[PDB]
Ligand binder design. Structure first.
Ligand SMILES: Cc1cc2nc3c(=O)[nH]c(=O)nc-3n(C[C@H](O)[C@H](O)[C@H](O)COP(=O)(O)O)c2cc1C
Ligand code: SF4
Ligand code: SF4
Ligand code: SF4
Ligand code: SF4
Ligand code: FES
Ligand code: FES
Lengths: 214, 230, 59, 432, 66, 41
């Protein structure tokens, strides 16, 4: 299309670029493949390729061909799966991959202020990996954590109910390397009403009430 | 006995239990306009031009893959259908280049035929018109992918019949490119035939190139040599 | 709007504005035109032989 | 029975304890909280009693589908075949302003798993997949821990709960796409092929995951179902109007003080849903502009309507906007709603697949047109063009997303049209 | 040699005559006096396409990429 | 009825533990069917 962040092709530079799984990781992949009925075994392409991106921060095309080899599937399905889904990044990123929900009530919640504050505090524009390494900034659509005030994502974590000052706090904590507590902050610990802790306040019922007359 | 009465415009016809809708309309002479469906290729819901209304039924059903229970009455010219066809044709013509002068299939391409004989007469939607990076493939197949309607024919053929399995789609929304992701040459026996299956001018014959034009040429029956299959 | 003789035109920085698309030949009510188009060096398409019979031509 | 009064809630009769992340999260905590109690007697009591139990409850599905569960799960009662059966629990939560599945699967895993087992034995499924949004790594990991607890306890697996039946469960993370949450394309995302939805004439029931009969059901349905079997049928049917009965989560977002998550009676006045549970509308009840009921796919509700309209599938259909996932968002008057809904359209454009031409083209249109409305450089006649675009898209495509992308615009057009042409006109003036 | 348009003495080259049924072809050929040769009509062979057969369990047919 | 958030243990996950727990879930489960073939090809 005309409006795109990055196109999807392999032009050059990684035909043979080395990628190898770790033996323990072969054990892991075997464990994964054991979860599907035989005669298919192609269902594991997506989880195994996930794993590839997991141990190697970004997958080169040699990783795609390699997974296709491990599962003995035509590689074009591997490339296809790699492009069609958002998780997989086919281009290298930094150690920390920053993701913000700009769409809807996060958007209604001032999250744009969060984005701008990030761009200034880090000092770079959107979509560009920072000079040196380890910080990348892209906005993603709804991540599902919503009632908690506008959320930002770092690798496998949810920072919820985020004000710009605390954004700066987190970012500098990552500059030092100490990863802050994942859970949402400024009260609201684990998705609650801030004021009342309303609805159920009572001790939960035991294994009763189930009489059923049977 | 393993036959089913199903009306077409009130005209009954006896068909087999599990023949498609499009076939059932073929039997009485209706040819429902279509793209991605092809006689030799497995069914897909991509083109959406096959839509047809069945009375008493609120939604329009796709005639390609819909099996025919007993007693369906298939109204081809019902207003809802024609509106559906005009719609689908419009959305297809939304993003398409104007290549008909340069394009090789100008005397043939089914977008022009079905465009006149079905779709609406005037377009809309000014700001728009995405473009696609073209991809060289073989010496045989000249490739301009901007004209691609993304109808999945070439894929299904290469997979099932050709057996190479090297063609696919990568993308979402507006942006889906149909072809090799790694820019590999695709060449095989039977590969050239793909230029007949591409319904639009996306794929065409490289050596035949620009030389000719369909209406000007005189077709002549013949046989083949160089292969004992006759 | 007067109709004289059949000049071909080209773009500024002349490209041979003719694309070879065959239409002018296709609608010719006297059939008198000829177009044969071989893709040239640049890969763009122009006409090899583009002919008219002003005899046959009804203007 | 329960008369027109609804929205009054009774604690200790609720379904989900711990939803706020309290007390003890384990098989031991959930054990003492009532999960997995007598459940062997359910499974040995037979499938038909479970099915008839759900139908007696008359509960309705989730995810905005609104279909009755007893039928969907009743399809699988077909005499068995040489091919296995599965239970696919949908853990994906798409659309904005929701949080629906996340909080449940985090704070009460064993209820979800127990639901999976009860449904599996009910329809005869061999195993239960759970496909979760890949964003949820930590969450689904907690799910892994709880499932491991279930196997170590011998609670599921071979001879689950010591019963005469064995039911395994598997869990698969997602690849991070919205349409993976759709009933059908989910199947093939499990199959490893890029997720795109199948045509409906083959049903998921008839030909499912790996081509074998299976069903798809949301975390709410599956998770609540075993306790539905343990509450006695009509008990659950006590709440809500007899058309749509029982309880459901309502996750309030948008602009209100204390946006949060609660569980309520099915039928509730939206006004009460705001007042007596989550804070209040910022700036007062009169400061609201419009409210989006349920999922983002649902059309707008104007003030004078949402004031009087309760929360019900059928009642909201009377409001012309079908109910979504029940997580509602509200909008300040100060905000520009055209920008909000336009951005929502951008969400739909970025999440969709390229099979049906009508979404992959039309939704492009509505993106660019809605952006033009944001800048207001269009002309007044064009809004109706946008309408007929939405109509010609709706109903012509495979999945509901295409339909789901048509409704919001239509909503914005119906009530708020006169708000457009003043922005149209002030662009005419300001620009010329 | 002046231009190179194709040329012939073949006054009958460009004729074509549309007939409804073959009996009318042989009829007009017989009657009109010049010898003829008939080719037999061919049609598409009736097929069974079941969309579900794309996804089937043990059957070799399965659609990759769909 | 002490009020404290008790899932704090989930903050302790590096990015392996999901799949590693899948490894720890090895066996414990019925062998799944073979269909008719090794691969659909
Ligand atoms: C566009 C679209 C989005 C969907 N999003 C979700 C989702 O976020 N979560 C989910 O569990 N199911 C989702 N579904 C699937 C529905 O849950 C499914 O149609 C149905 O509700 C499952 O049956 P149930 O109501 O018994 O759970 C989606 C379906 C479509 C078409
Ligand atoms: S593909 Fe068809 S519609 Fe498009 S330029 Fe070629 S002839 Fe015209
Ligand atoms: S290249 Fe041609 S055959 Fe292939 S999807 Fe595009 S239009 Fe269809
Ligand atoms: S072939 Fe004829 S109609 Fe086409 S560009 Fe040339 S002069 Fe014009
Ligand atoms: S409407 Fe769009 S997203 Fe949905 S199945 Fe069709 S092509 Fe895919
Ligand atoms: S033939 Fe039915 S969708 Fe193309
Ligand atoms: S709206 Fe931002 S996370 Fe759902």
């Amino acid at each position: 299309g005309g409006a795109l962040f990055v196109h999807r092709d392999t032009p050059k530079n990684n035909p043979e670029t080395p990628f190898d799984f770790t033996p323990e990781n072969y054990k892991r992949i075997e464990a994964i493949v054991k979860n599907y009925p035989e005669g298919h075994k192609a269902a594991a392409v997506l989880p195994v390729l996930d794993l590839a991106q997991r141990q190697n921060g970004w997958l080169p095309i040699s990783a795609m061909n390699k997974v296709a080899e491990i599962l003995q599937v035509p590689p074009m399905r591997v490339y296809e799966v790699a492009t069609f889904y958002t998780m997989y990044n086919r281009k290298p990123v930094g150690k920390y991959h920053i993701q913000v929900c700009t769409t809807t009530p996060c958007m209604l919640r001032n999250s744009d202020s969060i984005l701008e504050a990030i761009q200034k505090k880090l000092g770079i524009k959107v979509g560009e990996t920072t000079p040196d390494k380890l910080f990348t900034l892209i906005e993603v659509e709804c991540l599902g954590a919503c009632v908690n005030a506008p959320m930002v994502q770092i690798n496998d974590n949810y920072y919820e109910d985020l004000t710009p000052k605390d954004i700066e706090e987190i970012i500098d904590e990552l500059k030092a390397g100490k990863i802050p507590k994942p859970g949402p902050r400024s009260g609201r610990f684990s998705c609650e009403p801030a004021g009342g802790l309303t609805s159920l306040t009572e001790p939960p019922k035991g294994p009763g009430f189930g009489v059923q007359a049977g | 006995s393993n036959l089913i009465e199903v009306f077409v415009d009130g005209q009954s016809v006896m068909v087999e239990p599990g023949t498609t809708v499009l076939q059932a309309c073929e039997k009485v002479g209706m040819q429902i306009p279509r793209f991605c469906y092809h006689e030799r290729l497995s069914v897909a819901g991509n083109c959406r031009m096959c839509l047809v209304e069945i009375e008493k039924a609120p939604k329009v059903v796709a005639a390609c893959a819909m099996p025919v229970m007993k007693g369906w009455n298939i109204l081809t010219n019902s207003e809802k259908t024609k509106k559906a066809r005009e719609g689908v044709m419009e959305f297809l013509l939304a993003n398409h280049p104007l290549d008909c002068p340069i394009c090789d299939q100008g005397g043939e391409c089914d977008l022009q035929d079905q465009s006149m004989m079905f779709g609406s007469d005037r377009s809309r939607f000014l700001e728009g018109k995405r473009a696609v990076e073209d991809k060289n493939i073989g010496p045989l197949v000249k490739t301009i992918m901007t004209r691609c309607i993304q109808c999945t024919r070439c894929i299904r053929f290469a997979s099932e019949i050709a057996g190479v399995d090297d063609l696919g789609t990568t993308g979402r929304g507006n942006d889906m490119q149909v072809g090799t992701y790694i820019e590999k040459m695709f060449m095989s026996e039977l590969s050239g035939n793909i230029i007949d299956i591409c319904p639009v001018g996306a794929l065409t014959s490289k050596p035949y190139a620009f030389t000719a034009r369909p209406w000007e040429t005189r077709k002549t029956e013949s046989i083949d040599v160089m292969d004992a299959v006759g | 709007r007067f109709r004289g003789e059949h000049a071909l035109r080209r773009y500024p920085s002349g490209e041979e504005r003719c694309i070879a698309c065959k239409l002018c030949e296709a609608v010719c009510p006297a059939q008198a035109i000829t177009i044969e188009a071989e893709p040239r060096a640049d890969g763009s398409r122009r006409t090899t032989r583009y002919d008219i019979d002003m005899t046959k031509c009804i203007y | 029975p329960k008369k027109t009064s609804f929205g009054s809630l009774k604690d200790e009769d609720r379904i989900f304890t711990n939803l706020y992340g309290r007390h003890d999260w384990r098989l031991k905590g959930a054990q003492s909280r009532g999960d997995w109690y007598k459940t062997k007697e359910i499974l040995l009591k037979g499938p038909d009693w479970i099915l008839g139990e759900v139908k007696t409850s008359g509960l309705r599905g989730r995810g905005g589908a609104g279909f009755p569960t007893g039928l969907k799960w009743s399809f699988m009662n077909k005499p068995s075949d040489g091919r296995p059966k599965y239970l696919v629990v949908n853990a994906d939560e798409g659309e904005p302003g929701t949080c629906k599945d996340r909080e449940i699967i985090r704070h009460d895993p064993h209820k979800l798993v127990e639901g999976c087992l009860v449904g599996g034995r009910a329809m005869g499924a061999r195993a239960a997949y759970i496909y979760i949004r890949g964003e949820f790594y930590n969450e689904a990991s907690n799910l892994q821990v709880a499932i491991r607890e279930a196997y170590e306890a011998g609670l599921i697996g071979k001879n689950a709960c010591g019963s005469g039946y064995d039911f395994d469960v598997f869990v698969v993370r997602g690849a991070g796409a919205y349409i993976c949450g759709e009933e059908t394309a989910l199947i093939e995302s499990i199959e490893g092929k890029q997720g795109k939805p199948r045509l409906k004439p083959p049903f998921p029931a008839d030909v499912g995951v790996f081509g074998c009969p299976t069903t798809v059901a949301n975390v709410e349905t599956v998770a609540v179902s075993p306790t539905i079997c343990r509450r006695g049928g009509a008990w659950f049917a006590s709440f809500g109007r007899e058309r749509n009965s029982g309880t459901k989560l309502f996750n309030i977002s948008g602009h209100v003080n204390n946006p949060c998550t609660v569980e309520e009676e099915m039928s509730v006045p939206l006004k009460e849903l705001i007042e007596k549970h989550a804070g209040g509308v910022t700036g007062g009840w009169d400061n609201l502009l419009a409210v989006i009921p349920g999922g983002s796919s649902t059309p707008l509700i104007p003030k004078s309507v949402c004031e009087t309209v309760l929360m019900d599938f059928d009642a909201l259909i009377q409001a012309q906007t079908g109910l979504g996932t029940a997580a509602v968002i509200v909008m300040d008057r100060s905000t520009d709603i055209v920008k909000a809904i336009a951005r929502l359209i951008e969400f739909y454009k970025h999440e969709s697949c390229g099979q049906c031409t009508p979404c992959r083209e039309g939704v492009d249109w509505m993106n660019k047109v809605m952006a033009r409305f944001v800048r207001g450089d269009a002309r007044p006649a064009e809004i109706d063009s946008l309408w007929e675009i939405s109509k010609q898209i709706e109903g012509h495509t495979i999945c509901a997303l295409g339909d789901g992308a048509a409704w919001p615009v239509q909503g914005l057009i119906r009530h708020f049209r006169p708000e457009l042409e003043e922005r149209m006109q002030r662009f005419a003036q300001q620009h010329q | 040699p002046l231009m190179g348009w194709a040329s012939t003495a073949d006054p009958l080259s460009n004729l074509v005559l549309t007939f409804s049924t073959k009996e009318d072809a042989i009829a007009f050929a017989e009657k009109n006096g010049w010898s003829y040769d008939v080719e037999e009509r061919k049609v598409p062979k009736p097929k069974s396409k079941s969309y579900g057969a794309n996804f089937s369990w043990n059957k070799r047919t399965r659609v990759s990429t769909k | 009825d002490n009020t404290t958030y008790k899932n704090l243990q989930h903050h302790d996950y590096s990015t392996y533990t999901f799949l590693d727990l899948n490894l720890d879930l090895s066996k414990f489960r019925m062998p799944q069917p073979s269909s008719g073939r090794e691969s659909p090809r």
